[PDB]
User: What shape does this take?
Amino acid sequence: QGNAKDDEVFGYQERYAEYRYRPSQITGKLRSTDPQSLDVWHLAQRFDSLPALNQEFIEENPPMKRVLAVQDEPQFIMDAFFDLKCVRPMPVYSVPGLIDHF
Amino acid sequence: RPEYLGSGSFDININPVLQNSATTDASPQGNLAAYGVSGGVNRGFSHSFVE
Amino acid sequence: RPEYLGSGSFDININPVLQNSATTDASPQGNLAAYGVSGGVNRGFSHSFVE
Amino acid sequence: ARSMRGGIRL
Amino acid sequence: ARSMRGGIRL
Amino acid sequence: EGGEVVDNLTINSLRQAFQLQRLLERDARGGTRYIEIIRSHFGVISPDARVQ
Amino acid sequence: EALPGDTFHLKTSVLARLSTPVVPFMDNLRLDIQYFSVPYRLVWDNWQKFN
Amino acid sequence: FGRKVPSNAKSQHNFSVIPSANIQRSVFNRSSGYKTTFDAGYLIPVFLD
Assistant: This one.
């Protein structure tokens, strides 16, 4: 920002971590800060104010609303099917009866 | 602690789609839209329960 | 009782169709419609009639 | 799948 | 050493 | 006045009474700590460590 | 709900469709499924006394 | 059409894995004597560690 805040601590990380890590970057007309931005092409977060290391920062929150053509419908429609083979302590069909038994 | 029995994961494959309709003010012929799909079979877990 | 001579069955396969026409207020490019079709050959029954 | 920094979160 | 009647007591 | 009214016995009520008695007899004979319940009502030998 | 002495073997099939993107956006996007066992005695203190 | 490029997400995950602790285990004898008087039927705690 150029504010004095810029030199204040976000959080702590291992010594020389920036030689080991290399965060991925958006550079050109793709940035969400551009007045005529192409940020429809990618899912990089846009911070509107200074992120702190807290719950709001680390919770997964991709900007799906901008890469998707239809507004106000759920992002994923899913069909799922669960095929269980069960061994269970019961018969496969129970016929009523057997009063003294079990 | 609740036991972690297993996991699976899939790519959401994003596949390009060509506009074969003619040029418009909205989008030119040869413009490149997409659709997204994901799926497969997992072999999730096998486990036996003591309680 | 009337005798049950045999049977056959087929899936109605529902096949996705991509919109290659440009984006509209109705539907975006890359929207996914469908068509449905079913069929095959059965080998239905073989039988001889006494009456 | 190993021991992550900051404790476990999947 | 087996399952005793009245529940376990050693 | 001041009696107690009870309905006719269905066979389903009667067999449920028998199987409830079998359950309470299994509890007396087998024990009622949660590990004793598991071992008496099911075939299962739970480890002690996982049941505290 | 699993009983004492159950054994489960689970296969999962998934089909997830992403609602239509504007462009083939460049970022990877994983779908995943994780399964957990939770004994009833971890979620209710009276579970043993109920039994 | 083109082929997608990889993400760095796996290498970034690997840099975050802490090393295992080096423990310095050893084997030794921890012998001890205990002497007492007691009466029948009680549960007497003779060993504690």
Q: What stands out?
A: The two ends of chain G are 16 Å apart (CA to CA). The longest helix of chain G spans residues 47-50. The interface with chain H takes residues 26-28 of chain G (CB under 8 Å). The first strand of chain G starts at residue 7 and ends at 18.
